[PDB]
Amino acid sequence: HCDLPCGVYDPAQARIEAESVKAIQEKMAANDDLHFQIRATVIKEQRAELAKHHLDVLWSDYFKPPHFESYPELHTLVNEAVKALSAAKASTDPATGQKALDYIAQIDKIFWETKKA
Amino acid sequence: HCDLPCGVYDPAQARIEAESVKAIQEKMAANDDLHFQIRATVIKEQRAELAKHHLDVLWSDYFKPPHFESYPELHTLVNEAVKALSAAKASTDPATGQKALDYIAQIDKIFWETKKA
Amino acid sequence: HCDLPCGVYDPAQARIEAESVKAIQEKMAANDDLHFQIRATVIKEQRAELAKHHLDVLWSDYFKPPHFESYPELHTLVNEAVKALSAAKASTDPATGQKALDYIAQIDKIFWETKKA
Amino acid sequence: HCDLPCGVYDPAQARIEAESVKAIQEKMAANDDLHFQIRATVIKEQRAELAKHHLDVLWSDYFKPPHFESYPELHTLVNEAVKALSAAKASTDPATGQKALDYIAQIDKIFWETKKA
Amino acid sequence: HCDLPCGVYDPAQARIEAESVKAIQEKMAANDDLHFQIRATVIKEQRAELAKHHLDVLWSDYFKPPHFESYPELHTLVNEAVKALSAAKASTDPATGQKALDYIAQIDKIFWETKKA
Amino acid sequence: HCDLPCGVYDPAQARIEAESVKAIQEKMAANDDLHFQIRATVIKEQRAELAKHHLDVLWSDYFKPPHFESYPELHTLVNEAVKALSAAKASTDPATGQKALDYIAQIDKIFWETKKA
Ligand code: NI
Ligand code: NI
Ligand code: NI
Ligand code: NI
Ligand code: NI
Ligand code: NI
């Protein structure tokens, strides 16, 4: 995932950051304190960005043409996952974080299938 | 391109960085000093990574679902573009840099097209 | 602009970031939702900082002694441009973003003169 | 791990980066090309630095006084783990990479025990 | 502090960053404006994170096993210092900023003792 | 130095990084091992860049029009210091590092004089 390439990839990198995004949204629903809301917003923004980056790397570095052929829906799925993460940055509703996690789980399923080749 | 979103995007951000990648390769062919080769490799890696990032942003943030419909080859185009940049990272041949610049040139055309649409 | 040096420079890097700063300020006037204001402020801070970095690079790396000799106002001009960006960070008024853009345009004009020459 | 805090932690982040480190050391032994050696060295340095950061976060954010009391060796363990990652930066021997992974495995074990608790 | 290693370390790096934290907390009590509060929180978050980073570097790179044996309280001291910085992030009370600073002083004293020795 | 502004500045930040740059150059002269040379180059590059960043901030954020009026040589002195740092990036000669340290000492002197007035 370092583009050497190193041959070491794992959707867990994206998942763990997306889990923080959703966990932050959940905590935002419980505390309306201004300062807390500002910090949560700032940190959620950064974790979502990191999650988007990990997915972009899977898409550009790990998945190859044969993969995009075996799963003709892969491009859309990844593009949807990153767009779902952008929507999560702009929201405090845990449902947006959940949508991103759902898309990531599907990407993760495909990923390990390509690992079984 | 900041994901606010701000409504400001431009393939030029990617081109300028890719231009440094090619310029660096050309300098690499003419100067074989070790320390220069080390510094040049390091910097080319960074500029190419910034180029990939700029393209990833256009793909994930700028291009909307309707855009991919109107240009069903855009997914592959951007994916080849980023991979072309990855190839440039592992090459001192100015042609690799040019290849990446060529893909970016196509993407730039579809971009301005969606802008005027 | 990578300090190799690579020979590739373009004030357009600073301008695009400055354009985002202004565009964000424009939007901040039309939406007073608290979370939107927080995200807008956070993101404007980053785009302004990037614009400052790009100008600093032009000043330290691209412009050389003969240039400062030919344009004795250049040092002040760049310094004012970066200070204008700092003021844009601390403000929601689109005028502050515009002022930074106007200095950048002046810098850009001087830049292309040094290129043609 | 974002310090909000979000409540989401996983030694896996550290492990994935450390695996890249060892994987790169292995590839280096096989390819003696100068440019590949440079890229491998640069990238290994970055992945190791990331691994160190992830471990630093667990030590400073996740682990609390009660944990250090129940595990009097934790401070030294984590410290030795990060120092091992430092040794891995300065080495091409895949063994140095394994030593870091071994330490991370120990931290991981203590981690989940504090989770199940 | 760069981990080459370069043999150049100084708790000053952490102290200056921790100083901005307290200074910002003080300025926050003097201005209730929303945008100012947002910016101050955003910037305080960054400065504290850098201070934590600098202490982590000292803890993992500068201090060697003998130091932790010579000063049995060192591990706990550094850990308390970074946690105090995390507490400053989540607070606008200049006191939290000061507390983190007092810890840094104690660490700075031990640092010099190990130096002169 | 964070641009809030926070009111906390110190040329020492630049100095400490420049000191690592010269130290690294000295080490490079005593060890010709390829991998050490690669790491030393990569690290010296990052430290020199950070030193430049710190000087850029002093120039853009700390020094004001009255200071530039009082010290007509200030613009040139700072620009010389950052160029000296760029030269040290491209060199293994400790003399280039020492030249940057010399300019920083002059800037430091002026800095503290402005603190006395
Ligand atoms: Ni990798
Ligand atoms: Ni944007
Ligand atoms: Ni360049
Ligand atoms: Ni977290
Ligand atoms: Ni160092
Ligand atoms: Ni500051």
Side-chain angles (χ1 to χ4, degrees):
Chain A
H1 55 276
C2 54
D3 214 3
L4 171 56
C6 70
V8 180
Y9 295 98
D10 200 320
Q13 292 192 289
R15 177 176 59 67
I16 301 173
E17 292 303 340
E19 296 181 328
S20 293
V21 169
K22 198 182 73 157
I24 293 171
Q25 292 174 316
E26 291 170 351
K27 292 185 171 303
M28 290 178 91
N31 180 7
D32 238 351
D33 186 283
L34 179 54
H35 286 85
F36 170 76
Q37 285 288 316
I38 297 172
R39 301 189 56 240
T41 299
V42 177
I43 299 179
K44 171 161 62 64
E45 201 72 25
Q46 305 172 322
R47 318 324 292 175
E49 179 61 16
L50 282 169
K52 288 178 66 183
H53 175 62
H54 292 312
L55 295 174
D56 289 341
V57 168
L58 281 181
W59 182 74
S60 67
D61 297 15
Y62 176 78
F63 292 123
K64 309 295 201 304
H67 291 150
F68 292 124
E69 277 300 295
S70 308
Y71 305 77
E73 77 280 43
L74 192 54
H75 285 300
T76 296
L77 183 62
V78 180
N79 197 269
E80 289 175 310
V82 297
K83 273 176 171 55
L85 285 168
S86 282
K89 281 180 182 175
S91 175
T92 59
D93 177 355
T96 56
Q98 185 56 55
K99 183 174 183 178
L101 283 170
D102 291 337
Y103 282 134
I104 290 171
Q106 297 188 299
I107 292 178
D108 176 280
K109 181 186 171 67
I110 294 182
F111 174 82
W112 292 107
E113 288 191 356
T114 63
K115 295 290 293 182
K116 301 191 177 185
Chain B
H1 57 281
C2 50
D3 214 4
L4 170 61
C6 68
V8 182
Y9 304 84
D10 201 317
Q13 291 184 287
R15 172 173 57 64
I16 304 173
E17 287 306 332
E19 280 179 358
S20 287
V21 171
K22 188 189 175 185
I24 292 171
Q25 296 177 311
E26 284 172 350
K27 291 177 181 291
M28 289 187 92
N31 182 1
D32 306 309
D33 171 76
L34 178 62
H35 290 84
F36 172 71
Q37 289 291 317
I38 296 176
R39 294 189 60 245
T41 298
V42 168
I43 295 182
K44 171 161 61 69
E45 195 80 3
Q46 304 173 327
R47 317 328 292 175
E49 183 53 41
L50 283 170
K52 292 174 68 184
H53 170 69
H54 293 314
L55 292 185
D56 288 336
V57 172
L58 288 182
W59 180 72
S60 69
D61 294 16
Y62 175 76
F63 293 125
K64 301 298 191 303
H67 291 162
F68 293 110
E69 296 288 289
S70 303
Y71 306 101
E73 309 298 342
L74 189 49
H75 281 307
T76 298
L77 175 54
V78 180
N79 199 263
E80 276 175 49
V82 300
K83 285 179 164 54
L85 282 164
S86 285
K89 285 184 174 176
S91 174
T92 56
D93 187 329
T96 60
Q98 182 56 49
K99 181 175 177 176
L101 284 168
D102 292 335
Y103 282 124
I104 293 165
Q106 287 173 273
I107 297 175
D108 180 67
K109 292 171 184 58
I110 296 181
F111 175 80
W112 289 114
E113 202 313 300
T114 59
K115 286 296 295 294
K116 290 191 269 66
Chain C
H1 59 282
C2 53
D3 217 353
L4 176 61
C6 65
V8 185
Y9 298 95
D10 195 331
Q13 292 189 290
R15 181 179 57 74
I16 295 179
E17 292 305 343
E19 284 177 344
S20 289
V21 170
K22 184 186 169 191
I24 288 165
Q25 292 170 322
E26 295 288 354
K27 284 179 165 56
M28 291 179 84
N31 190 343
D32 54 51
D33 167 72
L34 171 64
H35 290 95
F36 174 73
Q37 290 289 313
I38 293 163
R39 295 189 62 240
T41 299
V42 175
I43 297 171
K44 166 166 61 70
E45 198 78 20
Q46 308 171 313
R47 314 329 293 175
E49 182 56 27
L50 292 176
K52 292 178 70 187
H53 175 67
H54 289 317
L55 292 180
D56 289 341
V57 166
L58 279 179
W59 179 73
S60 71
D61 294 16
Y62 174 73
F63 290 120
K64 307 181 173 62
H67 297 144
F68 293 113
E69 193 195 335
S70 295
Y71 303 87
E73 76 274 33
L74 193 51
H75 280 299
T76 293
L77 175 61
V78 185
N79 199 261
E80 284 171 341
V82 296
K83 283 178 162 54
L85 286 166
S86 290
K89 284 183 176 176
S91 162
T92 59
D93 181 355
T96 57
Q98 182 69 53
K99 190 171 184 173
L101 281 155
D102 293 340
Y103 284 134
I104 290 170
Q106 289 182 243
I107 292 175
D108 185 85
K109 184 75 62 179
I110 291 172
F111 174 84
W112 289 109
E113 283 172 28
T114 67
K115 296 299 294 182
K116 306 166 189 172
Chain D
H1 57 278
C2 53
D3 212 0
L4 168 60
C6 66
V8 179
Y9 296 100
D10 199 334
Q13 292 188 289
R15 182 174 61 261
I16 302 180
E17 298 300 359
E19 298 179 307
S20 277
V21 173
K22 184 180 180 185
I24 293 174
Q25 293 170 319
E26 305 188 314
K27 292 181 178 298
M28 289 179 87
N31 196 318
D32 85 322
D33 174 90
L34 175 61
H35 299 140
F36 174 79
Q37 287 296 306
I38 297 165
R39 303 190 56 247
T41 297
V42 171
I43 299 177
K44 164 163 65 74
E45 199 82 16
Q46 313 179 312
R47 317 328 299 176
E49 177 55 32
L50 284 173
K52 293 178 66 183
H53 174 64
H54 290 313
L55 290 182
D56 286 353
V57 169
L58 292 174
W59 178 74
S60 67
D61 296 17
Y62 177 72
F63 290 124
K64 306 290 195 300
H67 299 135
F68 294 120
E69 188 179 58
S70 305
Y71 299 97
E73 75 277 39
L74 194 52
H75 283 301
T76 292
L77 176 63
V78 180
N79 194 272
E80 298 190 316
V82 294
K83 278 180 169 55
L85 287 163
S86 286
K89 285 182 178 179
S91 169
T92 55
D93 190 334
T96 58
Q98 185 52 53
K99 181 177 180 179
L101 292 170
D102 293 336
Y103 275 119
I104 292 181
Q106 281 177 286
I107 297 166
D108 183 63
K109 216 167 185 291
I110 291 181
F111 180 73
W112 293 105
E113 284 185 14
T114 66
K115 296 294 292 186
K116 291 168 297 189
Chain E
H1 55 288
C2 54
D3 199 45
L4 164 60
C6 68
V8 181
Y9 297 100
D10 200 325
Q13 298 197 290
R15 182 172 61 271
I16 303 171
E17 294 304 351
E19 296 187 314
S20 295
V21 172
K22 187 190 182 186
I24 293 168
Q25 288 173 316
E26 287 179 355
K27 294 182 174 293
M28 288 182 85
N31 195 332
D32 66 0
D33 172 85
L34 171 59
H35 293 91
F36 177 74
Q37 290 291 304
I38 293 173
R39 294 191 66 240
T41 301
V42 163
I43 298 185
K44 167 162 63 70
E45 198 75 16
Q46 305 170 318
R47 315 331 297 178
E49 177 60 18
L50 274 166
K52 289 179 67 184
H53 171 75
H54 293 315
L55 295 181
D56 288 337
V57 163
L58 284 182
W59 177 75
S60 71
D61 293 30
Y62 174 77
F63 293 119
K64 300 299 191 297
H67 301 129
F68 295 110
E69 294 291 345
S70 295
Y71 300 93
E73 81 275 45
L74 197 56
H75 277 305
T76 297
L77 177 64
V78 183
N79 200 266
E80 289 177 299
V82 300
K83 279 180 164 65
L85 283 166
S86 284
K89 283 185 176 179
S91 167
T92 63
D93 185 346
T96 57
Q98 187 52 57
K99 180 172 183 181
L101 280 174
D102 294 329
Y103 278 121
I104 292 186
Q106 312 186 193
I107 298 179
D108 177 84
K109 184 172 180 293
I110 297 181
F111 176 79
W112 289 120
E113 280 177 20
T114 68
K115 258 296 180 180
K116 64 180 182 179
Chain F
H1 60 279
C2 52
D3 214 2
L4 169 63
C6 70
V8 184
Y9 301 90
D10 196 324
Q13 294 190 290
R15 193 187 67 239
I16 302 167
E17 296 300 357
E19 286 180 3
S20 284
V21 165
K22 189 188 176 180
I24 294 173
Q25 298 177 311
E26 281 174 345
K27 292 179 181 297
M28 291 177 83
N31 185 336
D32 76 312
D33 173 68
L34 175 53
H35 294 78
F36 174 72
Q37 286 290 313
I38 295 174
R39 294 188 64 238
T41 295
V42 169
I43 301 179
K44 168 165 61 71
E45 196 82 358
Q46 317 179 313
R47 315 324 295 182
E49 177 57 23
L50 295 169
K52 291 177 70 187
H53 171 69
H54 293 310
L55 291 180
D56 285 344
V57 169
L58 281 179
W59 177 77
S60 73
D61 297 17
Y62 178 80
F63 288 117
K64 308 290 196 295
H67 298 143
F68 293 118
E69 180 187 298
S70 301
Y71 298 98
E73 80 269 35
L74 192 47
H75 283 306
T76 294
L77 172 60
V78 181
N79 198 262
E80 279 175 335
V82 297
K83 281 176 164 58
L85 283 167
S86 284
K89 280 184 177 175
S91 172
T92 67
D93 185 350
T96 58
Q98 184 55 56
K99 182 66 183 178
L101 282 169
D102 290 317
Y103 284 139
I104 295 181
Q106 300 182 201
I107 296 172
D108 191 68
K109 178 171 184 178
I110 288 175
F111 175 77
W112 292 109
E113 287 187 349
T114 62
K115 302 292 284 178
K116 296 175 186 173

